[model samples]
Target chain A: AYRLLNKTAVITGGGSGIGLATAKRFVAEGAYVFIVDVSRKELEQAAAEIGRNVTAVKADVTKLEDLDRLYAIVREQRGSIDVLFNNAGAIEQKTLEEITPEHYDRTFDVNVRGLIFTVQKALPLLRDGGSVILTSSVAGVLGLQAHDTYSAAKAAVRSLARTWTTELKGRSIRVNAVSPGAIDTPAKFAAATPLGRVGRPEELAAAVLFLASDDSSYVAGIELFVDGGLTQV
Target chain B: AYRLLNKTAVITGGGSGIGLATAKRFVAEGAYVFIVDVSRKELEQAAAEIGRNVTAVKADVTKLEDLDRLYAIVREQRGSIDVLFNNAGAIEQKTLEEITPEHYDRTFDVNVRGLIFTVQKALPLLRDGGSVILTSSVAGVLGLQAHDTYSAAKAAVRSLARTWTTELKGRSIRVNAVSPGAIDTPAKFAAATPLGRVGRPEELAAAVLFLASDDSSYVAGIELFVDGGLTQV
Candidate 1:
């Protein structure tokens, strides 16, 4: 019996990158997974790549409507949500002088506004004592150049984890954020991090599972930084 | 010339608690200070007792409007904000089963909502690059049965430190949270801490001042726990 047997998980940004890797692990651990991605092409490909237990939904994390539909599909199939991985996010690198209001809005829309609504709308489906994990970043912890908007948005994710833990405590749901420094996901090849090296997606997924399972029952409202000590060093 | 000289700062929950001690230290360092509390009589007495550069503002921290007026007064006098010590918070000892919704909301309204808005509204007055120090708790780091709500609320404040750092990075503002384990403000202590005694408020104030000044220039998006290693043990 796996830790997630019979559990239904909803993961955002699941088409590829860390999301796909996590979806694969969750399925291997015996959970039925619902994946949401901004790219329609990647959604289909990820579902095929992760095997039958994983269902792909083409949805943009920046849109609340998309997340609502993703939850609706989960509700129809499994009736409740046991874990939520708020992982769908992207970064456009720009130095402080190069940032525009549009750049800020886009990043915050996907990383903050979308993730907040995703958890807000999932209250009805999240079982009491369920887990809500937000994908934060080392950028959320350290001040790196050219990550202004992206870091700000990811920082919002970290805050939401805390605010929601207090707001949702009545339901016994635990909320936490994980800040990965430089995971060696495809996203890393697409972006630069403070450590100069990349972390494996599986390494981060392990931390996610730790937060999403009974293993971290005593932990609440904490951001587990999984950046291979870059934040520390 | 001091960045905080002639600048007024408002600190909440500042009577015999961490607030009073921090106020005492703030005056010594050069800030014109206003202390908020629920007890008007004691607040006035504290104003007289603290000696200099200190004003007492009587208001409940759970109310948003009260905090709004606090910053308004600071704005009128100083024309700019230099620092904010969102340090006025209390903890109640209760098991998870004993925690009621009212308890949870009251805690959040003060610890999470009040703390969040304390920084948000202060944006109108806080100088770019100014320091914002929030008082979190060691409970935020480790798990304890009877202190779940307090732990959760403090954990949320810790997250605010991270998110606010990212949110305010572009402005050069520094936001950090300080978690103090057991600080002894008086002799009438109820519970014992790992250090076998409560911590002195001035001890924590030193930690707060570090974050409040450029001494912690590179330190952001982090929770510095001054618990004598309680979080570790």
Candidate 2:
């Protein structure tokens, strides 16, 4: 079924890994996608690999000017987007004792500030009755080692979903957090899975598609964890 | 996306309402469905309305004879099923003071006993990697006037999910409960929805599709409520 037939979507961090996997999923669902990334080369490679209904643009989510340009191109090309996955995120592993101002700033700059403005700037272009899915992490709830700043940023992303859900409900745009566990990205550590292994990149993409489509019409505000029960179990 | 493409599905209570709506969804996603309901007339009507890749069978789930026959046809026709939604249920309103043995028996016999065997007999025909979703109700947790026995049976349905999850995990099969609040059905009082109205049958169907397909591959045991957050709010 074409769950997203003819819809327009904007996905940040769509150059590779889980983001690229989701880009493929959206296009397969019959949506036109605008994929943004800091790496122009990776973006180009992703677009070429997907072949059709995909537009790749280079931008750093941490830069407000770049976010403005990102949605500017989207508005000029598609006028409005039905789905926005703020998947562009960053992480740094530094224990509390090793943490620096630079560490905290960069971590929050990309995952928190960047994700915030990515949607804020796109507000004008985001279609009502659409959906917004933020990529959070298991670290948001778990106390992970050497990733204090990154974990705090993920927790912030999760919090943003609740406020945005209340603020955006009147507009009919559903917002939710997708907290992923330690996934085997296109790029980790072999983690314990009750099912025997970490999740695949495409598995993350599939979960995003559910939130982005009419399949979850009644689903409003919730953190849909696609982590094989890693965070909870 | 064709998330359920080329898959096989079995749905009880599929002659009308939520089950009928789900039948349409599964077919749209490219699955061949065998729908079981008590009324042959309604089954015929549903099959005609759906028009393709559908097999309608009239079987009272309360009867073991009917259930065995039900799956016999399935085994002969489709070989195996990738999804099973034990959605057939019954309800009768009566206060505790007025309740009789007949009332309690009918309630448990249909909702609890009938639903139990529906899946029990189908176990042989269910593929190892498939999914089983039982139709539970918010009444499972909430106290309601004049519905004590029915409420308890719903509670049993919810409880069974946990045991089934453990029992079936080894087979790679996921077992979950789907609790629905008071729905308008196809056949009600306009209830208050924070979003403003009672749910449509199609809305319930969409949520079930999420659980039935690969989109929820990592989702194992949980009650995916599809009632517009009515229970929570």
Candidate 3:
């Protein structure tokens, strides 16, 4: 038996980086993990490589149909949903002028639009007093460049957790957002983060678990900034 | 003459409370005012009550098309947009369990969605070196049951300012967020703030003007919290 024994969780963009690291922790803590990702190669590779009590689903967050199929599988296999790690988003570093309408819409479509639908659709399976964690950014409240659309959408996403927390409070489903700074993901190692050092994905997972567990029972509609003193300075 | 001399400004929700008070300060320090809000009754009343060099426009911030018309009038009359005082959002006192989805959406739409669109539509008229000031709240960062949704929205707004500051830096347009705590509005007389007393609107307005004017030229992507150590506590 583990800390998260029998708890069921759905993690988006679970193939690598923060998502993969969190999945590993959740499994270690005795939770059944369902991983969803857009990249078939990444999903299959991660599923085949990271052996644990985990199932992998190829789903594109931007596409509603893909999320629908993924959720269907979770309902059928797991029987219910207890925790949701809504953590699929990206950024393109560019000045404001460099960002076009296409960039803005695409960014929102994946970060905001995709995230909103993911939670809204999950309302059915989400058990009362469940936990919902959103992946946001320190850019949401910092001066980071080449991140206009991503930052804007992430700010809105942070606000959504607050609204969602209140709306879902009656059902006892806590809603919270996590803001990470300069994470050392395999995706892009070129961009410099505030810490002068990138964060480990496991560190972020601990923050997610804090919001998901009963430890933060009184915490609702708040942003847990795990930026390693980047924001403080 | 200050840098904002002869420039026209349009502040929504500018009848009483923070809006009207800031308008008074703006006019005193050199700014032509065209205040917008649904409280025509309040607008006319405040205009007569405050008796300042300002015009009033009856418009609701929740309406998008209305914001369109609001800007059109300013563009035609003033010829260019310079400064935006986006301090037009508030919320009723409610516990987390007491709010509904509609209430949450309404608040988010006004504070987050409406605020974003307000800036987006105004971009055409905003001068290259313009400034945007948004009102955030200490409640955003504090974990208080008294001010839940409102506080979360304020926190998100502060984040928005930080992100926009970096995003809009290219245009030489500065975006900063001001967070006020326990302001002594007329309603505040009934309930004392946690600070043992409430802050005067003028005190907060002075802080806004500082961010609005060239005095803060080097300051960007920062949140100036106007709380009397409440947030620090």
Per-residue lDDT for B1-233 in model 1, tens only? Answer: 35356656677777767778777777777888888788988898888878888878877765668767877777676677677888776778655335554665566567765665566677878888788888888776555546655665676566556666666787888888888887775532214445666677788877887777666888877788887666665
> A-chain TM-score in candidate 1?
0.92
Candidate 2 residues B129-211, lDDT tens each? 89888888877877889889988998898888767776776687877777776567541212533334566788888889888
Task: Score candidate 3 by lDDT.
Answer: 0.76
Task: Tell me each candidate's TM-score.
Answer: 0.61, 0.85, 0.73
lDDT of 3 by residue, A1-233 (tens): 46688899899989899898888888888888988888888888887766877899988877768878978998899878889999896787555545554665577678766776788778888999889999888777765666656676677678668767766777999989999887778723223434556778989999888887778888887889887766656
- In terms of TM-score, how similar is model 3 to the real structure? 0.73
Go through the candidates in order and give each one's DockQ: 0.07, 0.37, 0.23
True contacts kept of 1: 0.02
Model 2 alpha-carbon drift over 4 Å, by segment: A91-105, A140-156, A187-192, A229-233, B1-6, B63-65, B90-109, B137-159, B187-194, B229-233
For residues A119-229, write the lDDT of model 1, one tens digit per residue. 767888999999999988877655555665566456556655665677678889999999987666555522443555678888788889888888899999898988766
Residue A179's lDDT within candidate 3 is 92
Q: Which regions in candidate 1 have their CA more than 4 angstroms from the true location?
A: A1-21, A28-140, A143-178, A181-233, B1-7, B28-31, B59-68, B78-81, B92-105, B127-130, B146-149, B162-175, B185-194, B206-224
DockQ rank, highest first?
2, 3, 1
Give the higher-lDDT candidate: 1 or 2: 2
For each candidate, report what fraction of the true interface contacts it reproduces.
Answer: 0.02, 0.37, 0.29
Q: If the candidates were sorted by their lDDT against the true structure, best first, what order would they fall in?
A: 2, 3, 1
Checking candidate 3 for backbone clashes, the offending pairs are A93-A146, A94-A146, A129-A172, B139-B151, B140-B151
User: Candidate 3 lDDT, tens digit per residue, B5-52?
Assistant: 776677866888888888888888778877878876888987775576
Worst 10 residues of 3 chain A by lDDT: A187-196
In model 1, state the lDDT of residue B194. 53
